[PDB]
Paper text:
The gastric H+,K+-ATPase mediates electroneutral exchange of 1H+/1K+ per ATP hydrolysed across the membrane. One of the notable differences between HKA and NKA is the presence of Lys791 and its salt bridge partner Glu820 in HKA, which physically restrict K+-binding space at the site I position. In this work, to elucidate the molecular basis of the different K+ stoichiometry in these two pumps, we evaluated a series of NKA-mimetic mutants of HKA with increasing substitutions.
Accordingly, we introduced a Glu936Val mutation within the triple mutant and determined its crystal structure and Rb+ anomalous scattering. In the structure of the quadruple mutant Lys791Ser/Glu820Asp/Tyr340Asn/Glu936Val (KS/ED/YN/EV), analyzed at 3.2 Å resolution, the side chain of Asp824 does indeed face Lys791Ser due to the loss of the hydrogen bond with Glu936Val in TM8,; however, the distance between Lys791Ser and Asp824 is 4.7 Å, still insufficient for the desired strong linking hydrogen bond. Consequently, the position of Lys791Ser remains different from that of Ser783 in NKA, disrupting K+ binding site I. Nevertheless, the anomalous difference Fourier map from bound Rb+ in the quadruple mutant shows a spread density distributed around site II and it is elongated towards site I, significantly different from the spherical density observed in the wild type4 and other HKA mutants. In marked contrast, only in the quadruple mutant, is Rb+ density at the cation-binding site significantly stronger than that at the P-domain at higher contour levels. Assuming single Rb+-binding at the P-domain as observed in most of P2-type ATPases, the observed stronger Rb+ anomalous signal at the cation-binding site strongly suggests that more than one Rb+ is bound to the cation-binding site. Therefore, although the observed strong Rb+ density in the quadruple mutant suggests the binding of more than one Rb+ ion at the cation-binding site, the second Rb+ is unlikely to be well-coordinated at site I, in stark contrast to NKA, where the two K+ ions are 4.1 Å apart. Consequently, we conclude that the crystal structure of the HKA quadruple mutant is obtained as a mixture of one Rb+- and two Rb+-bound protein molecules in the crystal lattice.
Residue numbers in the entry:
A (entry chain B): 30 to 290
B (entry chain A): 49 to 1033
The structure:
């Protein structure tokens, strides 16, 4: 407004002073905040009540996962298979090297940090456990024979226990297909679909830098050809719930599949 | 109009095909009725109610709320090309904008309907009639049936039916107090006095009242062609100006709009630099310009203006527009009509002369003033001569209406005497019916006296009272003794001369002096049963005994003399605009206070100094009386110089249009003018004024329809309420708007940062809507229930060009200081709530792409935990619900700090404003219900929130209290230039 050039400087200095005063208050507030935060354990973790279930290959055209392909055209499933492979490039024998061979089936509870630089020990998972649904001996993960291999992973919540009685198991089945068409026949690798109970509790990336989630794979044998089907993969465990209507990805993953020959 | 009173009866009765003796024909009079229409003023021909609500939808704030809604809908197209999600937020925001404008308009329409109906609950729907001579027969018809050229008979107490030319008349006197301001009853004769029909005597006017006499005339004009009609229709041509509050709201919507354009342009340029596409950067520009718009400020302003109209209604003052509630506090000049508005327009007895003393009476209606000596022997005789010699009588069943307001059947002179006897004595008619009337001679020019011979109460006195009244010099030529101090002394040259010095003193004040004389008749010369005669006088028409003098005038109204004083002590300049002759104007200007005591005109200095008025320098005079004849000879420059040079002004013999010129000149010079009025002579100049006040009982329908304020009780004291309340709201709206304005930046900066740092969205639209249209209405409306921060009624009138409702200091403070603190509180609570649930501040930077991606159901946090879209959507809703409470808890401080602008809260009192504290409680209660009611997580975007984050912003709230208290003590303790120029709102 040019009321007075000389007075402009004094009120400009007042405004910069006000802002830096409140900025210092704000900076002190964020630093006292961060000093109140434990780095291995979430302070509240309110919304992480029950876990999410995620699927590979992940292809959403619209309105959810829609994986449609033609077995006689390599271009329709090469991307699917490559996403699987580049996903499992960190589930590689010599890339999971930072963890330890885990033979304790019931649990892996660790109260003290016993790894370099005050880190903890982590459990191991290589691609071998997915015996058929691996690059060995099929680099197509079952997609070239109309028996696709879909790999199911559970989301990690710090010090979350899914139930000690048995291990969480993925039952993948047809959704609203009670017709003369037969149930979805699935061969799961690891067998019986069990996520081993020694990959719980997760203690945080700072505590377990090399931790990698367990995986299960479903070889979908019975899937009919040239038919759009829908499949729901539900994880059955005590602390896992699949009835959430505001999170369709809670303890379950649903996908549309069309194998065209 | 000029060539209708100048004609001869021969030419008139050919013009209108009528006769001065036989009247119109039943046939032609029913033809002219269908040609010229009814003899009624034409009501406004247009009143569509849909175009009545449409006008309520239009305003400056409404225009901004309209253009911003259009911007929102255009955004819902730019964001529909590129298909986006949760986009229905724009639809809610725009619909809420339009909804606010609609419902506030509905409120305004309803509260104007209420006012109009109340103003019509006092109006007279009784048909006014006339006596018509048609085909030679006198019958009574409705005035709307009269046609041009009809023979009309007028009687005392009859409203004149049309615009009439007097063909014959016997002592006819009419009250042209609507057309002119002539308080003094005006005589109508069948002969041409002037040619301007306003000052000639052969013409009677449409809505004038025949005070006394009898007349017969020819209707020369009916309808909107009467003087009434053309003045009221000229009042249609003049166009009302914008109310001052409207201009200030428009300047406010200039400020917020310019700020919005600057903000949006800055961040549009910045967004293009960051790397956003032109289309999406422009959507964000639109978002900024909408964020500056206040959703609910129109609602709170309307509610405040309604709450200060309810008060004024309870003080018997009704406003038509809600905008009038402020307009009297910005007023600098008040223009007032002398008759009716300032006076009572009722001849009452003012003074008396008996026992060689000029007694003065109570001229008021409340009878507040002091009456006179009512114990002398002379007074009882005077109160008998004035009581008995009065052929007038009150109408029936008025024994509950106050004596002044009662309707009397009698002359202008006799009505005041009857009301005087009623107030001073009581039961005047019953007292008069204790002394029969043997003989009377009321109205003859040869005798010039009302004679009445009565018989005394007691039969102990067969003596006969002879009471007669008339012009004092017609009385004294017939009296021989004077009643003084319990004696009948003779009329020396001294007593005659003192009577003359009283007649010429009580008649120099502009009063109707009347003299009363009496005599007691013998029981022997005139035994009970004497047969009196008039042709051959057999009673004494001479040798009477003088009783006293009684003088009547048009008195000032009760509360006026103090009302103009309390107005003037507020810096308001009171000017008078009357059509009455100058002497009456000066008298009722000195009495009421427009002309200060000890102030003299240039014509008075020329009598003090006995100098020609030319040599008397004008600047040495602080008062002036300017006639219409010399206001028509005066150019604009002369008016401006004469107006400022003489501070106290009285305008005399003005016309409808000359008043309009005065108001126009004062407004052009930079004043907010207010016109107080009654009668059709003020309907022109009541429209152009910024506020037009009309007397609700004594005012004509034209001045009550072309007004903005109606005083139902005719209490001129309501004006001195309308200022102070009107002032308060200004100062109490400057506060309210300020508070609401602060909410823009603590709402904008989230979004401004949600794009600038790409943090997850802190605050959503469904929540800023709840902030603006639910939580911040009760506080701001409460801010108007506050009390004065000074002697508001002694402060000089606010300067239009310097002192404004919203100025740059106010908006700059409310945004950049206070709302910045609020934004910091929100950011602290945002980073805190996120870090407690797994998202550290550094990770929040740049996370919005993956936060809002519908395809990532395994996003990993700072602790390494993996979240789906729904889980972190609920957590985003938590950021919403904590920024919400951050703002509301940081504004519980705002309402308190803005309850005062100079004084501290301790001095005024924290809890002194009750509605403020009720609103604070309601704010927190609505917050708790919204967060912890089952289902609000998905009905709206509010969820149960931990009780640690309620208290993170409280330090900030106390910082607000501390900061405003220090910056308010800075102005009060040190009224220095620095703080007041830079840090005072
Ligand atoms: C002050 C503010 N405005 C918004 C806002 C959104 C979210 C948070 N917002 C905040 C905190 C979105 O729903 C939209 O971009 C919306 C919008 C879009 C275009 C034009 C006008 C408004 N504006
Ligand atoms: C499993 O444990 C064996 C020892 O039994 C050790 O070689 C290694 O940790 C794991 N096996 C392989 C092949 O790496
Ligand atoms: C899995 O692989 C083994 C050997 O590689 C084979 O015998 C078996 O049939 C395979 N299962 C399916 C379902 O193809
Ligand atoms: C699958 O691919 C082959 C060759 O690419 C094509 O001939 C065939 O029609 C495809 N199947 C369908 C159902 O279109
Ligand atoms: Mg009047
Ligand atoms: Rb970017
Ligand atoms: Rb806003
Ligand atoms: Rb008196
Ligand atoms: Rb007006």
């Amino acid at each position: 407004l040019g009321r007075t050039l000389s007075r402009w400087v004094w009120i400009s200095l007042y405004y910069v002073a006000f802002y830096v005063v409140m900025s210092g208050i704000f900076a002190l507030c964020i630093y006292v905040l961060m000093r109140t935060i434990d780095p291995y354990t979430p302070d509240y973790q309110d919304q992480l009540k029950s876990p999410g279930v995620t699927l590979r290959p992940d292809v959403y055209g619209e309105k959810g996962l829609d994986i449609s392909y033609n077995v006689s055209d390599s271009t329709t499933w090469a991307g699917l298979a490559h996403t699987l492979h580049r996903f499992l490039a960190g589930y590689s024998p010599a890339a999971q090297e930072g963890s330890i061979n885990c033979t304790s089936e019931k649990y892996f509870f660790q109260e003290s940090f016993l790894a370099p630089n005050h880190t903890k020990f982590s459990c191991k998972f290589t691609a071998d456990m997915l015996q058929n649904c691996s690059g060995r001996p099929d680099p197509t993960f079952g997609f070239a024979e109309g028996k696709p291999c879909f790999i199911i992973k559970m989301n990690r919540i710090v010090k979350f226990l899914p139930g000690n009685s048995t291990a969480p198991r993925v039952d993948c089945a047809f959704l609203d297909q009670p017709r003369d068409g037969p149930p979805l026949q699935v061969e799961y690798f690891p067998a019986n679909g069990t996520y081993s109970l020694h990959y719980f509790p997760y203690y945080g990336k700072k505590a377990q830098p090399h931790y990698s989630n367990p995986l299960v794979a479903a070889k979908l044998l019975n899937v009919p050809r040239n038919r759009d089907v829908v499949i729901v993969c539900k994880i059955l465990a005590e602390h896992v719930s699949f009835d959430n209507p505001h999170d369709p990805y809670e303890g379950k993953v649903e996908f549309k599949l069309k194998i065209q020959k | 109009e000029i060539n209708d009173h100048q004609l001869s009866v021969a030419e008139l009765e050919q013009k209108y095909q009528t006769s001065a003796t036989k009247g119109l024909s039943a046939s032609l009079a029913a033809e002219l009725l269908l040609r010229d229409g009814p003899n009624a003023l034409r009501p406004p021909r247009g009143t569509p109610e849909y175009v009545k609500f449409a006008r309520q939808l239009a305003g400056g704030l409404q225009c901004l709320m309209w253009v911003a809604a259009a911007i929102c809908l255009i955004a819902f197209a730019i964001q529909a090309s590129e298909g986006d999600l949760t986009t229905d937020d724009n639809l809610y925001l725009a619909l809420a904008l339009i909804a606010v404008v609609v419902v506030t308009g509905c409120f305004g329409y309803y509260q104007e309907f209420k006012s109009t109906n109340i103003i019509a609950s006092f109006k007279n729907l009784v048909p006014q009639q006339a006596t018509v001579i048609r085909d030679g027969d006198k019958f009574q018809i409705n005035a709307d049936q009269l046609v041009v050229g009809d023979l009309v008979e007028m009687k005392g107490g009859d409203r004149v039916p049309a615009d009439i030319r007097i063909l014959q008349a016997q002592g006819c006197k009419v009250d042209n107090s609507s057309l002119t301001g002539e308080s003094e009853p005006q005589t109508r004769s069948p002969e041409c006095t002037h040619e301007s029909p306003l000052e000639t005597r052969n013409i009677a006017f449409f809505s004038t009242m025949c005070l006394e006499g009898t007349a017969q005339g020819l209707v020369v004009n009916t309808g909107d062609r009467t003087i009434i009609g053309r003045i009221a229709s000229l009042a249609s041509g003049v166009e009302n100006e914008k109310t001052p509050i409207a201009i200030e709201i428009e300047h406010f919507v200039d400020i917020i709009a310019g700020l919005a354009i600057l903000f949006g342009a800055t961040f549009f340029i910045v967004a293009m630099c960051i790397g956003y596409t032109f289309l999406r950067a422009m959507v964000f520009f639109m978002a900024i310009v909408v964020a500056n718009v206040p959703e609910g400020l129109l609602a709170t302003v309307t509610v405040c203006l309604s709450l200060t109209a309810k008060r004024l209604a309870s003080k018997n003052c009704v406003v038509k527009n809600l905008e009038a509630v402020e307009t009297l506090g910005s007023t600098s000049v008040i223009c007032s009509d002398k008759t009716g508005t300032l006076t009572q327009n009722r001849m009452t007895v003012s003074h008396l002369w008996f026992d060689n003393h000029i007694h003065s009476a109570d001229t008021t209606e409340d009878q507040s003033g002091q009456t006179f000596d009512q114990s002398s022997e002379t007074w009882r005789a005077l109160c008998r001569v004035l009581t008995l010699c009065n052929r007038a009588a009150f109408k029936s069943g008025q024994d509950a209406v106050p004596v002044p307001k009662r309707i009397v059947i009698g002359d202008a002179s006799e009505t005041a005497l009857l009301k005087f006897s009623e107030l001073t004595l009581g039961n005047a008619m019953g007292y008069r019916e204790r002394f029969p009337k043997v003989c009377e001679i009321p109205f003859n020019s040869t005798n010039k006296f009302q004679l009445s011979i009565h018989t005394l109460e007691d039969p102990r006195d067969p003596r006969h009272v002879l009471v007669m009244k008339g012009a004092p010099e017609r009385v004294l030529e017939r009296c021989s003794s004077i009643l003084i101090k319990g004696q009948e002394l003779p009329l020396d040259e001294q007593w005659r001369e003192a009577f003359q010095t009283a007649y010429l003193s009580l008649g120099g004040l502009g009063e109707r002096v009347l003299g009363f004389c009496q005599l007691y008749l013998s029981e022997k010369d005139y035994p009970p049963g004497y047969a009196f005669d008039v042709e051959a006088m057999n009673f004494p028409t001479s040798g009477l005994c003088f009783a006293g003098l009684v003088s009547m005038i048009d008195p000032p109204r009760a509360t006026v003399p103090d009302a103009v004083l309390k107005c003037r002590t507020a810096g308001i300049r009171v000017i008078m605009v009357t059509g009455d002759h100058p002497i009456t104007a000066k008298a009722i200007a000195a009495s009421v206070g427009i002309i200060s005591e000890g102030s003299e005109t240039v014509e008075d200095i020329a009598a003090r100094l006995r100098v020609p008025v030319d040599q008397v320098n004008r600047k040495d005079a602080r008062a002036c009386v300017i006639n219409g004849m010399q206001l028509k000879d005066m150019d604009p420059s002369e008016l401006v110089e004469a107006l400022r040079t003489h501070p106290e002004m009285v305008f005399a013999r003005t016309s409808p249009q000359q008043k309009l010129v005065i108001v126009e000149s004062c407004q052009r010079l930079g004043a907010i003018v207010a016109v107080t009025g009654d009668g059709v002579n003020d309907s022109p100049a009541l429209k152009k004024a910024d506020i037009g006040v009309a007397m609700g009982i004594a005012g004509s329908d034209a001045a009550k329809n072309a007004a903005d304020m109606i005083l139902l009780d005719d209490n001129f004291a309501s004006i001195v309420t309308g200022v102070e309340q009107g002032r308060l709201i200004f100062d109490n709206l400057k506060k309210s708007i300020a508070y609401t304005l602060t909410s823009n930046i603590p709402e904008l900066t989230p979004y401004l940062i949600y794009i600038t740092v790409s943090v997850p969205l802190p605050l959503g639209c469904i929540t800023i809507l709840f902030i603006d249209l639910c939580t911040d209405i009760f506080p701001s409306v409460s801010l108007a229930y506050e009390k004065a921060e000074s002697d508001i009624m002694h402060l000089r009138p606010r300067n239009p060009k310097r002192d404004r409702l919203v100025n740059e200091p106010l908006a700059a403070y409310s945004y950049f200081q206070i709302g910045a603190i609020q934004s910091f509180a929100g950011f602290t609570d945002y980073f805190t709530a996120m870090a407690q649930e797994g998202w550290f501040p550094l990770l929040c930077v740049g996370l919005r792409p993956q936060w809002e991606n519908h395809h990532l159901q395994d996003l990993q946090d700072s602790y390494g935990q993996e979240w789906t879209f729904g889980q972190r959507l609920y957590q985003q809703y938590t950021c919403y619900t904590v920024f919400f409470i951050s703002i509301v808890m940081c504004q519980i401080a705002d309402v308190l700090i803005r309850k005062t602008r100079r004084l501290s809260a301790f001095q005024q009192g924290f809890f002194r404003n009750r509605i403020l504290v009720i609103a604070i409680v309601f704010q927190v209660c609505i917050g708790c219900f919204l967060c912890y009611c089952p289902g609000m997580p998905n009905i709206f975007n509010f969820m149960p929130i931990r009780f640690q984050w309620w208290l993170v912003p409280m330090p900030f709230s106390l910082l607000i209290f501390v900061y405003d208290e220090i910056r308010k003590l800075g102005v009060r303790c040190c009224p220095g230039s620095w703080w007041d120029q830079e840090l005072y709102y």
